[PDB]
Amino acid sequence: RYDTEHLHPDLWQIFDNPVDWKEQYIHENYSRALEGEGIVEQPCPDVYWFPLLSEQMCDELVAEMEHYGQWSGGRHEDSRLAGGYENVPTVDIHMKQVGYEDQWLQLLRTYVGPMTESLFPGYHTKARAVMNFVVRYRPDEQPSLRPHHDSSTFTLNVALNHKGLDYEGGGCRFLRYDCVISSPRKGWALLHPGRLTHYHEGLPTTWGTRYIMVSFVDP
Amino acid sequence: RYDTEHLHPDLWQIFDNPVDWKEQYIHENYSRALEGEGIVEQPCPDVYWFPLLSEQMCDELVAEMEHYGQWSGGRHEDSRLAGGYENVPTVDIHMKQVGYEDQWLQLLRTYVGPMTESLFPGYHTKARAVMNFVVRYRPDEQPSLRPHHDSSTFTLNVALNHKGLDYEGGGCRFLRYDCVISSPRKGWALLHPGRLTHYHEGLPTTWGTRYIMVSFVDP
């Protein structure tokens, strides 16, 4: 089985060929990071920073998002939310329309879940994420988000571009910890709680466009 | 209305005359702590230790618990829980059996909630608590519990007796923070998250009986 009506059909081959998809799309240091050989960084309390994705998979996902074109979002109301009122608006493309929600959920349940279990002793993860979308921030389309938390036990923020070369500006700002993640990594990602002990704030971007993929896991 | 069918009928008079209950039950320095001029202590990161209840209230609660006699608990399985299995068995009496759960909820909504809102900016509290029981820590009966977490956004623990004079032992130990509560206060209460960022293990009591109050807030 191989759906040929796709720009990058190998992206959905995770179910058919897990070994090849993992060897091609996952970061080379992901195994080293999971094995416990350093790599993981904790610049702020109750936060982590380890490599998750590689250049090829990130570029393919960015190209697919560009091919989708319909950069929805930006209005206070939400059409994909049951309540119909979204607290924070941002220009983003949902994974449901793109059809990558199932593949991303499987990838998170395979690789992301063991990482979360290893980082926090005594914590069992079922990888139940109800919201997963990639937001594109532009100097004229979507500015930095207002200071707000995430409606999830843990919130993961993954960058999709190389810092500096692709976009100029900043990332987030932890007001509680008085720390700012000013050096995002294209291949790495952060998985920290955002329910009660994290009042996340968005820093602004001056030049270029920045794309970040955040999935609300365990809500 | 003043029902005398209790050892301490004034313990149920929290709502009848809120001023009288606040004046005769709450901690004298609790108002100063709510004013934000000290008293509140943070021995560990993202942890609070401030006085909540007065000695008279603690004595009344201890006497009521002793007179109740329904000190159930001690098995991995349980009948009070809907699931029927308790993750961490403990000899504790739920507030539902005593019937003071309404009073505890009212006190949490009146005094605990504003402190939580003031202490942690950007968070809204609604005093949503379900699991709350008083467990007596006895070295001969209930030894130290294994390290575990809490299935709630926040956890509150209040001492019910003077350590050393009444019981000999320890408090809690933060596995991921290397923080040990060796000098807990009868009036002070421990408020911190217990879902993901903190793994805690209780220290073992040695002599006497240590009475503690456990409440799962925002489950």
Q: How many CB pairs under 8 A join A and B?
A: 53
> Considering only CA atoms, which of B120, B187, B111 is closest in space to residue B153?
B120
Token code pair at residue B103: 């009073």
Rounded CA-CA distance B169/A197 in Å is 30
Please list every residue in chain B followed by a chain break, i.e. its C lies more than 2.5 Å from the next written N. none
Quick check: B139 contacting A, CB < 8 Å? no
> Considering only CA atoms, which of B84, B87, B106, B111 is closest in space to residue B95?
B106
Q: Residues of B with CB below 8 A from A156's CB?
A: none
Cα distance from A157 to chain B (closest Cα, Å)? 17
Which chain A residue lies closest to B87 (C-alpha atoms)?
A122
Cα distance from A219 to chain B (closest Cα, Å)? 12
Rounded CA-CA distance B116/B126 in Å is 10
> Residue ranges of B for the binding site for Fe cation?
148, 150, 200
Token code pair at residue B105: 């909820």
Tell me if residue A105 falls in helix, strand or coil: helix
Cβ–Cβ under 8 Å, residues A171 and A188: no
Quick check: B166 contacting A, CB < 8 Å? no
Q: A44-47: long-range contacts (C-beta < 8 A, 24 or more apart)? A: A44/A174, A44/A177, A44/A179, A44/A181, A44/A192, A45/A177, A45/B45, A45/B46, A45/B197, A46/A192, A46/A193, A46/A197, A46/A198, A46/B46, A46/B196, A46/B197, A47/A174, A47/A177, A47/A190, A47/A192
Q: Residues of B with CB below 8 A from A153's CB?
A: 195-196
Cα distance from B209 to chain A (closest Cα, Å)? 28
Q: Residues of B with CB below 8 A from A120's CB?
A: 196-197, 199
Query: In sequence order, which residues have a C-beta less than 8 Å from that of residue A70 and are 6 or more positions away?
Result: A93, A97
What length is written for chain A? 219
Q: A7-11: long-range contacts (C-beta < 8 A, 24 or more apart)? A: A7/A60, A7/A63, A7/A64, A7/A67, A8/A60, A8/A63, A8/A64, A11/A57, A11/A60, A11/A61, A11/A64, A11/A100, A11/A103
A175 with B120: Cβ contact below 8 A = no
Establish how many alpha carbons lie within 13 A of residue A108's alpha carbon, considering only the half-sphere containing its beta carbon: 26
Which chain B residue lies closest to A150 (C-alpha atoms)?
B123
Quick check: B195 contacting A, CB < 8 Å? yes
Experimental method: cryo-EM
Catalytic: B75? no
The phi, psi pair for A191, rounded to 5°, reads: -130, 100
Instruction: State in Å, rounded, how far the first CA of chain B is from the last one.
Output: 34
